[PDB]
Amino acid sequence: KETAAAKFERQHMDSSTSAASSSNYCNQMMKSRNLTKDRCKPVNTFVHESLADVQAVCSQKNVACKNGQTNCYQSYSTMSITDCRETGSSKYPNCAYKTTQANKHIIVACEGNPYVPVHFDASV
Amino acid sequence: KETAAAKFERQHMDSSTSAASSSNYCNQMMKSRNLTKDRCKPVNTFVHESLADVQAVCSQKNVACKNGQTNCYQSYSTMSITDCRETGSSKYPNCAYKTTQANKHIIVACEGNPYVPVHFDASV
Numbered sequence: 143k144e145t146a147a148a149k150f151e152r153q154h155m156d157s158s159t160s161a162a163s164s165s166n167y168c169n170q171m172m173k174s175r176n177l178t179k180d181r182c183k184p185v186n187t188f189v190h191e192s193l194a195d196v197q198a199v200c201s202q203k204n205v206a207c208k209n210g211q212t213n214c215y216q217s218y219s220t221m222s223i224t225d226c227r228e229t230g231s232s233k234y235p236n237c238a239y240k241t242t243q244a245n246k247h248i249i250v251a252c253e254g255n256p257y258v259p260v261h262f263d264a265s266v
Numbered sequence: 267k268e269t270a271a272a273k274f275e276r277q278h279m280d281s282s283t284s285a286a287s288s289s290n291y292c293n294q295m296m297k298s299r300n301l302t303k304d305r306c307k308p309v310n311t312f313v314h315e316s317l318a319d320v321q322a323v324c325s326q327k328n329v330a331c332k333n334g335q336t337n338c339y340q341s342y343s344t345m346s347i348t349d350c351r352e353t354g355s356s357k358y359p360n361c362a363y364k365t366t367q368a369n370k371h372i373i374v375a376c377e378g379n380p381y382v383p384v385h386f387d388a389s390v
């Protein structure tokens with residue numbers, strides 16, 4: 143007969159170092175990239191792909207931008223993404239974030255020559 | 267001078283490292299922990315701290331449970347957790363979950379002798 147204490151452990155405990163570290167990814171990255179300097183940027187996305195692969199998106203699927211612009215491009219393939227969203231209890235300067243992992247198509251706005259990404263628009 | 271392009275790389279690129287966690291963590295964990303056997307549990311949280319630290323919460327900030335009971339306690343420090351939320355497309359027996367990670371104070375209900383956590387109430 144499984145005890146109440148053991149049941150709690152089975153459904154709520156996972157003492158893993160890597161799991162603990164991953165939970166702090168956004169908190170650490172938002173600070174490292176100076177995104178929490180004078181304020182907490184509420185939302186931000188990090189792409190775990192090579193720069194060349196992301197730059198290539200500008201020569202791919204031409205799509206409409208969320209702000210009415212037409213210089214946005216969507217990736218043909220899915221890419222490893224990490225969504226960082228500000229927590230309800232977040233307080234400056236200790237900006238708190240929630241880490242979410244996903245594989246989606248990224249949409250970026252491109253400008254200049256070379257035609258490279260200057261803004262992250264969305265993921266689909 | 268930091269160009270718009272450079273700023274994009276600083277704000278959105280993380281080519282040097284893969285995702286610190288999988289988006290399939292919850293799907294895997296809910297199954298192995300037999301949390302989807304009788305039904306798809308709507309939501310479940312996993313703590314990534316040592317069992318001792320979690321058990322200690324039973325002797326910390328006494329807070330009222332969401333159900334009106336007074337056998338709940340809030341942790342002094344924040345803990346690394348993972349929230350598993352059932353996806354809108356999930357359907358038993360094929361339970362699907364969304365994985366989210368953060369560092370928050372936990373609230374558990376304790377009872378028995380020794381006084382140990384028997385139910386995860388909430389986070390904050």
Ligand SMILES: [Cl-]
Nearest residue numbers: 182183184185
């Ligand atoms: Cl902004």
Ligand SMILES: [Cl-]
Nearest residue numbers: 384385386387
């Ligand atoms: Cl519970």
